[PDB]
Ligand binder design. Structure first.
Ligand SMILES: [Ca+2]
Ligand SMILES: [Ca+2]
Ligand SMILES: [Ca+2]
Ligand SMILES: [Mg+2]
Ligand SMILES: [Mg+2]
Ligand SMILES: [Mg+2]
Ligand SMILES: [Mg+2]
Ligand SMILES: [Mg+2]
Ligand SMILES: [Mg+2]
Ligand SMILES: [Mg+2]
Ligand code: NI
Ligand code: NI
Ligand SMILES: [Tb+3]
Ligand SMILES: [Tb+3]
Ligand SMILES: [Tb+3]
Ligand SMILES: [Tb+3]
Ligand SMILES: [Tb+3]
Lengths: 1247, 458
């Protein structure tokens, strides 16, 4: 705000005057004045004498004036510049300019309080002078007059017909012009005439100026305007035809053009030009469509013919241009325009891709409220129905939002629109085909016409405001769902993965994490669907292997629950109650259910709480009254509490799901689709409670309205835990539909009986479930599963009479392993016809067969196996190799490649062997896949009989980051070489702790090993607290000043059978200040965990990119880095990571070299190591692309990367380390447009 | 607004009671109560004994209940209706209903201030009771909880995933359902539970009612919801395949759909259904194109062959529908659809035709500040110039306004875009052909590059 200081120097020189101004410092301010004409002054104020910044493009770069011969009198105060037309006075103390006409009439002046300064100019003038310039008005603005006497509007180009600029002038005889890129002119009626640079304007600012460069004009308005044009430039003469009339038109072809010129010329109405809109050019098409004549509209524009013919009729042609390019063709491929622009840097800075339209259509809303309107609507839909549209996705039945069109549909429009399709489809098919619709509103009554509700155009983000504030995200959806159920519309779904993003359709897809969690969530909601924006893809395989496998996995649960679910579809036809409900339905009196939405009920007998948090390590799950059993991990929890529930943030395999005491859950084999085959055995899992609970099994055609007139099947199933027995009542069949179910296999959990009766006959016992299923006629067996003791009972379904079943006695199985027959598991491959198969054509197999056809690349079988805690499980694979030699197969667990198995010849195809492999399993569901990974060097070509999975691990593990943290303890990725997704720090204040829930099979002494880091330089202490008992001291030495170093602290602890608590806490005598990573637990001596073989830091690149890692990078001097890490979800279609969420990439649009490197000291010198990695490369074949192993004491080893567009595995075996170190790396030399993806890099000790 | 006045008449008959109320005129007010089930009461208030209006489509027109055998004692004050599940008292002077459970527990009541009246209903209840229903939230709103304890939000279908209605219930043991085309529910923590018809809502009102027809539910949440479904309708059963996974897609043709289905099937990833956006139909075309398969995208939907092949691979098809028709083809000709709808009066009342867009493109602004950028922009324009474009209509050099995309061009963007064509054409024609251009903005200096200014979309 301060003004100039005293003048200390005045150097005249021709028409120029340079004034030095005191600012108190050794670098004086400079003010140069230049008389450009008798009526035009240039002023340049340069703070501290600094060199002036370049003038903006306002200024004509070639401007030129004759010598003026001004008169500069520096001999007094004021200093005085004179011409015949003006008189410029500068008072010496402080420096202040006054501008006058040559007759001494004062025009404007810098007030005492301040003139020119660092950020502008400030004048004062006659208060009644009229001011013009600054601005005009656009086609969306209140349009004022000419006068600018009270103006604060910015100076800008603007939009939609606006104009403006740093130019303020008056009819009183002066003008002011400032060279600026935007800015804030200011006038008021006290007589101020100011201009300020200010802060960055709405339009951006790309020309900054450290100096202030202005011009003062003197004269009548013509002279002012002519002076304005000497400075900014005169206008070149346009063609003379430009003074003619021009007809502009959008929607026009050559024929209509020629008819229009005829019409003008026939009538002697003069005209010189037609301007053509989009019609003229191939806008939308590849190869510079937006610059090329559309010869469909204008055939003779193939040559100069059109031009020359229009010339001869006296017409010139004008074409519309937009300053942008099409970056996608119709087929969503990148255009040549895009590649040329992206590669040379031609896009406007800060403007990303966005979605436009350009072919409008004219529409009008139909009225569904009229019966005759409905009949018409239906009649015209019949042909589309006969030809395949059997469900009606009734969009936009609510509100129009199109420019000026802002029309609401009424409250019954969704009901009535549904009525049209319902009444019509029913009458047309004689009640033969059921109606499915969906809409995006609901109002009472709409449900009578068979419609679902979906939650509209929601956002691709975790929550409202994560990426943008204008739509909700995933976390809000449960609330929308349950709100709908509270309104009587529980047939609800959402766009899983989200619809909208920033940029519209060209905006990003979900992260793999978001995609995965959303699928697990949506699998436990009623209408389960993905839906992206235009040209987007929502197929799970596109988001990397975790997303595929986890989605597949949860999908298998859903489809196995088909008969559970379908009973609730029937319930909705009796009472309106559906597949989901909020907890307050079951718990009207419980305050903690009153507003509860992070969990809900799926049918009557399952409570679900999906992991919806980004990078979530644990959940706080409220369980209302009763006794709940973890569906996936086996443990019981008592009701009426908020539990701490650990989740594995690395696998994304967990879907917290709890079984309600009394549960009765019919389930079936997994089908690819609902009527793929007939199901003759239905399983019923039964979790008995002390009070009778029931579930009515239901079947019908799944297709027609026959159910309405009795054509359905139902059978009441009921159970109760009695003093010393379980009772299960299978009621008699009811209704005329002949069901497909022939037998139920009851799986009664919590008791392994010594006898099972039915009508006062003891049933025949069999040695196991397998033999029971082979037997025709009733039977029982017993066993063990994840939940504990279980009794199996197989009966006929659909008897004409009730059957009571009573399980008494207790004779627990000694079984040490679950058995999974792989022929019952999931079979896949590269195509529908190249999947793994079932066969019974060689002898010696267990169960009903074995799995064959693992002899075409990518064939595989996948087993879902429940483990009670994370840890090491030796899993036994029963196979047959009658080939002549050792075959290979990959074993993937939870989408990570655990090992290449070498499976020996077993003599013949009917001779079987066993290979047992130590697998890193996580608590709850695991995904174990045996696959012919041709791209990883496997051979395939064996047959698989089954696997066996110990009920108990050899050793257990517990992630610290998933433990219950308190007192300041937190999670972190800001140090290196932690395990899993993170570690625990901030064990700093007294009270700070982490508390593990550790399961033991039997009371005893158990070994612990606690992985920790202590970078303080000295020994530090925590306390251990086992089952809230007495504190024992935990003394933790420091290997030195390095927090990227991790030791084991080993100790013992006395535990009880079941859940134990073991806390590591800073009690007041302890020092704290350590980091915890993982607690290992065993009855034996604890060794290296299968989950922790990897010696690399951040080898999967999953660490949040804010935090660095042991990776370094190199590129040739002065070249931009070609290296980044992200998910590949901005791309369309997505180019996901090999596992989890992120992968490194190398890319540049131009020629480039790049490398990344990591050096690790190995634990054991003079020994053999192994580098494994996933790699995917695409587009331009590089000169060089390899993994690199070196520094190990031998010479560099390499493995080249092949340009395939697919995930391959790259293995460098037999790294003989004698140096103490390994350097692993990846290197690319490309001529440009080579895109390399690197992921899941492991350096391991090689057997 | 006044409460009912005194009871002057009380005719019990079967499961129904009929109250005549003094309004100080010769046309007394009627309150008809009807015990539909043990736990569901229908109240119909008819001002001045006027006949009732038609019920809205909220009400299931085929709904019916078994007889109940309620007990209706008109002997004293108050009048008393009894089922095994609920006790209804109507005090005679003035007429004010109290709803109780069978055991005497008061649930809700019409305050001394007044309950039902010509424009809706007013109740009072336990202030700490939790209220539910009324509304949900849409894809453009802040998303609240389930509780509706301080609610003034209107009852409406809404848009973008919203839901709502004149239905307000509590876990404290009761529900209230009012038959209405829109309207204004109110609750607060003093214990009010109210519903008003009020004025014509935003979404309009096509069913107006003179009477006030409402329903009281008594029970636990599941009983309340069953009663709601008795009144407004149960849901028909949907095809079983509808419990399966569905992939919805926009930007899809027959080959991409087949490639998708093969992808899910190869992996044993279950799926029952594909849903198709505009791609499935001839949206935009004449002869009911918005109802007809797009055989360019789906060749085998010429016949039933597409339906049947997909049916064999376990795939149902769903197709998108919009409640509108195209009234002009790409040529600007009036469509058959238009004539049939205009001539029978099938357009939504109050909705005129309008211009909408539907085929998207992806674009990205270029940078004219860079010399090399300009050279390139000119170079690719030479062919258009040789072939007749001699004037450059430079549109949108100012601001992008497309969805979330709100980018500004800088103040010299017009000048620099103009420069591209000026320098270029002047060089390429050896200064032989004068440049003409127009743009919709202006900033000082831009005049040097031969451009005019036009006043935009006026
Ligand atoms: Ca087998
Ligand atoms: Ca860890
Ligand atoms: Ca990764
Ligand atoms: Mg000069
Ligand atoms: Mg500055
Ligand atoms: Mg002609
Ligand atoms: Mg063409
Ligand atoms: Mg009745
Ligand atoms: Mg009224
Ligand atoms: Mg067609
Ligand atoms: Ni403006
Ligand atoms: Ni709403
Ligand atoms: Tb035309
Ligand atoms: Tb690029
Ligand atoms: Tb039932
Ligand atoms: Tb019983
Ligand atoms: Tb597509």
């Amino acid at each position: 705000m301060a003004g100039l200081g005293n003048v200390t120097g005045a150097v005249a020189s021709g028409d120029s005057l340079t004034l030095t101004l005191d600012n108190g410092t050794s670098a004086s301010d400079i003010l140069e004045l230049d008389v450009l004409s008798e009526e035009l002054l240039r002023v340049d104020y340069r703070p501290s004498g600094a060199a002036p910044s370049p003038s903006t493009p306002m200024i004509d770069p070639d401007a030129s004036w004759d010598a003026v011969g001004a008169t500069i009198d520096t001999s007094g105060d004021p200093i005085v510049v004179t011409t015949p037309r003006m008189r410029i006075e500068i008072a010496r103390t402080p420096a202040r300019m006054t501008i006058k006409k040559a007759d001494g009439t004062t025009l404007l002046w810098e007030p005492a309080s301040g003139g020119v300064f660092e950020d502008g100019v400030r004048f004062q003038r006659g208060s009644t002078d009229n001011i013009y310039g600054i601005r005009s008005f656009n086609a969306q603005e209140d349009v004022g007059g000419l006068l600018r006497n009270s103006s604060d509007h910015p100076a800008h180009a603007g939009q939609q017909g606006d104009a403006g600029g740093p130019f303020m002038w008056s009819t009183a005889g002066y003008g002011v012009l400032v060279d600026s890129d935007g800015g804030y002119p200011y006038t008021d009626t006290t007589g101020k005439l100011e201009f300020y640079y200010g802060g960055t304007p709405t339009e951006g600012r790309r020309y900054t100026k450290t100096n202030v460069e202005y011009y003062i004009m003197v004269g009548e308005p013509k002279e002012i305007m002519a002076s304005y044009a000497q400075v900014t430039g005169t206008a070149p003469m346009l063609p003379k035809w430009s003074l003619g009339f021009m007809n502009f038109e959008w929607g026009i072809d050559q024929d209509e053009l020629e008819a229009h010129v005829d019409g003008y010329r026939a009538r002697n109405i003069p005209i010189d030009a037609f301007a053509l809109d989009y019609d003229w050019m191939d806008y939308g098409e590849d190869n510079y469509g937006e610059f090329r004549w559309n010869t469909d509209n204008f055939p003779d524009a193939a040559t100069t013919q059109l031009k020359e013919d229009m010339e001869a009729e006296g017409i010139r042609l004008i074409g519309i241009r937009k300053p942008r390019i099409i970056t996608r063709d119709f087929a969503n491929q990148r255009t040549q325009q895009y590649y040329d622009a992206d590669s040379n840097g031609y896009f406007y800075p800060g403007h990303n891709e966005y979605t436009d339209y350009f072919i409008p259509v004219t529409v009008r809303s139909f009225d569904p409220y009229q019966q005759a309107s409905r009949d018409w609507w239906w009649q015209h839909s019949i042909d589309a129905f006969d030809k395949g549209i059997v469900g009606w996705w009734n969009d936009e039945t609510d509100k129009v939002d199109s420019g000026s069109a802002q029309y609401w549909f009424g409250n019954f429009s969704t009901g009535f629109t549904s009525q049209a399709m319902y009444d019509g489809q029913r009458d047309y098919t004689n009640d033969g085909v059921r109606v499915w619709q969906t809409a995006r509103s609901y109002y009472p009554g709409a449900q009578r016409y068979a419609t679902t509700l979906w939650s509209g155009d929601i956002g691709t983000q975790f929550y409202k405001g994560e990426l943008f504030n204008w739509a909700p995200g995933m976390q809000e959806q449960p609330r929308i769902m349950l709100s709908s159920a509270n309104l009587g519309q529980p047939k609800w779904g959402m766009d899983t993965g989200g619809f909208n993003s920033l940029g519209g359709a060209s905006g990003p897809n979900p992260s793999p994490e978001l995609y995965t969690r959303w699928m697990q969530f949506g699998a436990f909601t009623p209408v389960f669907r993905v839906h992206g924006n235009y040209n987007q893809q929502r197929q799970p395989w596109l988001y990397g292997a975790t997303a595929e496998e986890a989605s597949k996995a949860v999908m298998h649960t859903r489809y196995s629950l088909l008969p559970y679910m379908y009973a609730y579809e029937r319930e909705a036809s009796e009472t309106g109650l559906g597949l989901i409900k909020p907890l307050l339905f079951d718990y009207p009196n419980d305050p903690q259910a009153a507003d509860y939405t992070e969990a809900w009920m799926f049918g009557d007998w399952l409570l679900v709480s999906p992991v919806l948090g980004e990078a979530q390590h644990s959940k706080q799950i409220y369980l209302p009254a009763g006794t709940w059993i973890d569906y996936h991990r086996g443990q019981t929890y008592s009701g009426g509490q908020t539990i701490h529930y650990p989740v594995n943030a690395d696998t994304w395999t967990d879907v917290p799901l709890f079984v309600k005491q009394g549960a009765i859950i019919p389930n079936q084999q997994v089908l690819d689709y609902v009527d793929q085959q007939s199901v003759t055995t239905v399983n019923v899992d039964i979790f008995p409670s002390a009070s009778e609970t029931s579930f009515t099994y239901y079947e019908d055609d799944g297709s027609s309205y026959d159910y309405e007139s009795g054509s359905s099947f139902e059978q009441r199933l009921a159970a109760q835990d009695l003093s010393s027995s379980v009772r299960v009542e299978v009621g008699a069949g009811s209704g005329s539909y002949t069901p497909d179910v022939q037998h139920y296999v009851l799986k009664i959990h919590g008791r392994a009986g010594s006898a099972v009766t039915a009508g006062g006959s003891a049933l025949t016992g069999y040695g196991d479930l397998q033999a029971l299923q082979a037997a025709s006629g009733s039977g029982w067996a017993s066993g063990r599963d994840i939940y504990g003791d279980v009794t199996y009972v197989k009966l006929p379904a659909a008897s004409g009479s009730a059957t009571v079943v009573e399980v008494s006695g207790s004779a627990p199985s000694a079984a040490t392993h679950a058995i999974y027959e792989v022929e019952d598991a999931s079979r896949s491959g590269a195509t529908p016809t190249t999947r793994a198969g079932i066969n019974t054509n060689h002898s010696g197999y267990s169960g009903s067969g074995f799995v064959d056809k693992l002899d075409v690349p990518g064939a595989a079988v996948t087993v879902y196996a429940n483990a009670p805690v994370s840890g090491d499980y030796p899993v036994e694979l029963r196979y047959a190799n009658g080939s002549g030699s050792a075959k290979t197969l990959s074993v993937y667990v939870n989408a990570a490649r655990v090992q290449q198995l070498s499976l020996a010849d077993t003599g013949a195809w009917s001779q079987w062997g066993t290979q047992t492999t130590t697998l890193p399993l996580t608590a709850g569901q695991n995904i174990i896949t045996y696959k012919y990974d041709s791209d990883a060097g496997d051979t395939g070509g064996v047959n698989l009989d089954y696997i066996r999975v110990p009920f108990a691990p050899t050793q257990a593990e517990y992630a610290a980051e998933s433990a219950k943290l308190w007192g300041g303890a937190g999670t972190s990725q800001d140090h290196w070489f932690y395990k899993g997704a993170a570690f625990v720090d901030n064990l700093t204040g007294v009270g700070a702790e982490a508390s593990f829930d550790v399961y033991a099979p039997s009371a005893g002494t158990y070994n612990l090993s606690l992985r920790y880091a202590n970078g303080t330089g000295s020994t530090k202490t925590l306390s251990a607290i086992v089952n809230g008992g007495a504190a024992s001291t935990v003394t933790l030495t420091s290997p030195g000043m390095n927090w990227n170093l991790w030791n084991e602290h080993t100790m013992t602890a006395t535990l009880t059978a079941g859940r134990n608590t073991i806390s590591f806490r800073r009690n007041s005598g302890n020092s704290g200040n350590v980091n915890l990573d993982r607690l290992a637990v065993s009855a034996s001596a604890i060794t290296t965990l299968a989950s922790e073989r990897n010696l690399l830091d951040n080898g999967d690149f999953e660490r949040d990119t804010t935090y660095n890692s042991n990776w370094t990078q190199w590129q040739p001097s002065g070249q931009p880095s070609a290296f980044g890490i992200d998910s590949g979800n901005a791309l369309h279609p997505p180019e996901g990571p090999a596992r989890r969420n992120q992968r490194a990439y190398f890319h540049s649009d131009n020629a480039y070299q790049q490398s990344i490197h990591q050096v690790v000291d190995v634990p054991v010198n003079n020994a053999t190591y192994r580098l494994e990695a996933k790699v995917r490369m695409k587009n331009t074949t590089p000169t060089t692309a390899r993994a690199e192993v070196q520094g190990h004491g031998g010479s560099p080893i390499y493995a080249n990367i092949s340009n395939d567009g697919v995930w391959k595995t790259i293995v460098i075996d037999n790294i003989n380390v004698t140096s103490g170190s390994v350097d692993v790396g990846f290197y690319v030399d490309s001529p440009g447009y080579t895109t390399l993806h690197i992921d899941e890099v492991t350096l391991t000790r090689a057997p």
